[PDB]
UniProtKB/Swiss-Prot annotation, chain B:
The WHEP-TRS domains are involved in RNA binding. It comes from the Eukaryota. Multifunctional protein which primarily functions within the aminoacyl-tRNA synthetase multienzyme complex, also known as multisynthetase complex. Within the complex it catalyzes the attachment of both L-glutamate and L-proline to their cognate tRNAs in a two-step reaction where the amino acid is first activated by ATP to form a covalent intermediate with AMP. Subsequently, the activated amino acid is transferred to the acceptor end of the cognate tRNA to form L-glutamyl-tRNA(Glu) and L-prolyl-tRNA(Pro). Changing residue 83 to A: Almost complete loss of prolyl-tRNA ligase activity. One of its GO terms (biological process) is cellular response to insulin stimulus. The gene is EPRS1. The modification Omega-N-methylarginine is found at residue 138. One of its GO terms (cellular component) is ribonucleoprotein complex. The chain holds residues 1015 to 1512 of 1512 of the full protein. Zn(2+) binds at residues 430, 435, 467, 469. This is Bifunctional glutamate/proline--tRNA ligase. It is linked to Leukodystrophy, hypomyelinating, 15: An autosomal recessive disorder characterized by hypomyelinating leukodystrophy with thinning of the corpus callosum. Clinical features include motor and cognitive impairment appearing in the first or second decade of life, dystonia, ataxia, spasticity, and dysphagia. Most patients develop severe optic atrophy, and some have hearing loss.
Length: 467, 484
């Protein structure tokens, strides 16, 4: 790897994602191939989150990719299919940018009584938003994989409960799987989903860019969509009266992998948190009778490790040098390299090198390796945490806000929350700073006025430059 | 209640069964359907099995883009021209024309193989074995049918490249055998492995292998999955090539395979096993294998009966049986019976107060309807045994059905008679496109298509035997019939 993360972050990022064999470019802008090394991380995320939402009663299903004009405009850079071969469709049809308008008519038909609620459905699928701004692999693409969950309840408080549960699962994905610290909160009036009541969100910070990025989102839709699509049930108490269902929706994408790359990656390449590493430990070999024995010693380690449920690969290819293999698996971010040399074989001991720090370490010919893995995870998280702690500070006045913002940090400011003030904050700080979230647990507690002067502060709000 | 008979109007029965089992919901765009959880969980079971099996072969999962540029789609002879009117084109985003229109993938060769060519710089870069689960689109005007033939559908498509022919040949048959395991072992559906004829194979490939299944309610056959050897056709098209230094001065074009399997599986499961009470789920893929329902419904006694149903639920989960306790006050027990029968749940566990007070329950089989009174303490064992026996039974019945409806015939006379009887036929066949066209055209006065050239035909072909056309010698016994 040539480019340096602190010099030329875009070039560093492209080189990391391709030389780690995560991404390949497609001949259509903003579309990328997810190679197995990237996809396996998505598979790990999927296994965790799918089990967890199943524990909450959510069922998986698959709705059509195509949205009619009427369904879509029953409420915009949607991709329109307008012909098959050379012959025009009777009416153009749209590729889903999200599936509310595909799902909620079906919900309306399935709900007859309050006995039919709640409905909790999730799908793992692809969506398309065909914007013409600059794409970035993983972080912001035209086609992407995600999961979208869509719930409908009889009451408001079970919906609110789910909203917070799903947000906490997203925070778990980032913090426990990817070792990325996030700040939970809710979007401002300006930035919230216009189709919902409130939008909760997890925001992560990428310091090499000094920019924030949304990691996931969980919306309380309230009765907005149920009144739109007539998702109604009869009142269990009052004859002949109908109630509109309360709804949530929530989503999470492969952006995860990009954030994991941006946060933990270094100038040797990818750095994989052991919890999502497709390969946690790579075994590399360093008298011909002796050579055969060495290979057999590696296979011994491999089988043992496989037996202790550690994801492991023995790279015994004859065609490549050990130093080549060292660099290959470092670039890919394998948390531990296990080096087996003849002396050490003879000494019945071995060497383990951790990817995060490079700390080498000799050990006796199972237990240790697992112990190293966990520490690597903790290490990654705590460093990311310190980075966030360094780059997220309080400022009580605009001038202090601006200086700090220009130092490449994100700032919690007292904020009145009006949309006009938020646009003013954007252009005065000019790209300009946007609102990220109103944090659940702000750093310091809030008579204080907004940084606009004209109005009092309603809440500490986190602002920053953002992807 | 279903109130439509499978032996009368098969189409209406199918529609009723897939909707009333809560498998399918209709969409306002023809040929696209909502897969509700009851069916999507069957696809997820198939997925878990096939994923595990291909990983043991060294296949890795990935995800390539859904959009194909016009240049990449039209670049090589990847597919015949007759497919052109069935490609769906995105021509605008919002209100603004795209400079170049882009196509939705009907299959991903034109997206993957330029990448494969970039990735093969030497022998060490082979083999490449990649699979993806994803949706594809084929915008046909022919009458769609849920699960069986739709405009959008879910599938897996595997694409692999090798240094030698032997490796690729081996994988083709391994994957075909995996598809046969999906059908016979998970779905309880017997299939016939074989080779597609010249007319019916994938045109740009060297040969296509296939598994064919029979639907006796319709007298038709349908292809369950496919596994192609491409040889070096696509690698010479896309320049997926390396150099062996021990063979200076010769290119080595990769040998490739591709293979595919869709949600048609579920449709075939519905058509083979479904009866006049609704769906019938093979225990192996049933989302719920056992549903516990309280019957015969004092306040203390009611509390106790519900606790007992939950005891059964706990024990069944603890021995890895997928179980649902239907404890809803809103619906009658006889309605619960009907509802879970429509959905095809293999076993219904009835618990009444008299049975609770004698430590027993009733188990009712979905496939036969047979009722058994079972002692409480044997719940885990008996119920497991019964599930296995349901699986077996379904497969056995279907195989019996296949074996009576597939027979050998040696003349166009016998062939057309047996064909008209609603069966499929293994005939001696010369293999030529003209003569297959002729077989179809004649036997209409729809015509019979070829299904597959079986690896293991019923009867070995006689030497010098001539194909039913009488003009050419038979090259092989070939399974023909009316088809989906
Ligand atoms: C990969 C990815 C992710 C996401 N988004 C959105 C919010 C969200 C979060 N959190 C989803 C709710 C879960 C997320 O991840 C969004 C996107 N593309 C786009 O906006 C389209 C686009 C394309 C090119 C340039 C500019 C914009 N692309
Ligand atoms: C559900 C499903 C399945 C399959 N096919 C194909 C062969 C194969 C097998 N075996 C694939 C290799 C895996 C299969 O299952 C094909 C399809 N639609 C279509 O052709 C498009 C269409 C749309 C409306 C009416 C008629 C035709 N729809
Ligand atoms: O997609 C959403 C709302 C939520 N849906 C379920 C998963 C989580 C997700 O945030 C917001 N959104 C975002 N981008 C969009 C782009 C287009 Br184009 C359209 Cl039509 C609609 C939308 C649109 O509704
Ligand atoms: O899709 C195939 C060949 C194989 N691709 C890999 C997975 C298994 C599959 O059988 C054949 N086929 C089928 N239908 C098609 C429809 C269209 Br539209 C196009 Cl352009 C092309 C095709 C086309 O190539
Ligand atoms: Br969104
Ligand atoms: Br196909
Ligand atoms: Ca055709
Ligand atoms: Ca053009
Ligand atoms: Ca490789
Ligand atoms: Ca030559
Ligand atoms: Zn992998
Ligand atoms: Zn203000
Ligand atoms: Zn289910
Ligand atoms: Zn007793
Ligand atoms: Zn002939």
């Amino acid at each position: 790897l040539e480019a340096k993360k602190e010099e030329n972050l875009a070039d560093w990022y492209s080189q990391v994602i391709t030389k780690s064999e995560m991404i390949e470019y497609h001949d259509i802008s903003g579309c990328y191939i997810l190679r197995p090394w990237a996809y396996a991380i998505w598979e790990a995320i999927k296994d965790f989150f799918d089990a967890e939402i199943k524990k909450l009663g959510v069922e998986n299903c698959y709705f059509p990719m195509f949205v009619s004009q009427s369904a879509l405009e029953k409420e915009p850079e949607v991709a329109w299919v307008t012909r098959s071969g050379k012959t025009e469709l009777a009416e153009p049809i749209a590729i889903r940018p999200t599936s509310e308008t595909v799902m909620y008519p079906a919900y309306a038909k399935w709900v007859q009584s309050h006995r039919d609620l709640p409905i909790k459905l999730n799908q793992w699928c692809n969506v398309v938003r065909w914007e013409f701004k600059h794409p970035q692999p993983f972080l912001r693409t035209r086609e992407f994989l995600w999961q979208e969950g869509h719930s409908a309840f009889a009451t408001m408080e079970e919906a609110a409960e789910e909203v917070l549960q799903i947000l906490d699962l997203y925070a778990q994905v980032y913090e426990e799987l990817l070792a990325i610290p996030v700040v939970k909160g809710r979007k401002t009036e300006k930035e919230k989903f216009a189709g919902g009541d409130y939008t909760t969100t997890i925001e992560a910070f990428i310091s090499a860019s000094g920019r924030a990025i949304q990691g996931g989102t969980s919306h309380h839709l309230g009765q907005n969509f149920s009144k739109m699509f007539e998702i109604v049930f009869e009142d269990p108490k009052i004859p002949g009266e109908k109630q509109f269902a309360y709804q949530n929706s929530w989503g999470l994408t492969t952006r995860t992998i990009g954030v994991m790359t941006m946060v933990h990656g270094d100038n040797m390449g990818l750095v994989l948190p052991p919890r999502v590493a497709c390969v946690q430990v790579v075994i590399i070999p360093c008298s011909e009778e002796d050579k055969e024995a060495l290979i057999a010693k590696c296979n011994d380690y491999r089988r043992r490790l496989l037996s202790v449920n550690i994801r492991v690969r023995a790279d015994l290819r004859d065609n490549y040098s050990p130093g080549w293999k060292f660099n290959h698996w470092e670039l890919k971010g394998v948390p531990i390299r296990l080096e087996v040399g003849p002396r050490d074989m003879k000494s019945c001991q071995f060497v383990a090198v951790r990817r995060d720090t490079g700390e080498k370490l000799t050990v006796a010919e199972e237990t240790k390796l697992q112990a190293i893995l966990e520490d690597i995870q903790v290490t990654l998280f705590t460093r990311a945490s310190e980075d966030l702690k360094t780059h997220m500070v309080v400022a009580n006045t605009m001038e202090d806000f601006q200086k700090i913002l220009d130092s490449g940090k994100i700032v919690q400011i007292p904020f009145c929350g009006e949309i006009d003030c938020e646009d003013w904050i954007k252009k005065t700080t000019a790209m300009g700073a946007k609102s990220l979230c109103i944090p659940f647990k702000p750093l310091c507690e809030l008579g204080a006025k907004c940084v606009c002067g004209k109005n009092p502060a309603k809440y500490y709000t986190l602002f920053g430059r953002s992807y």
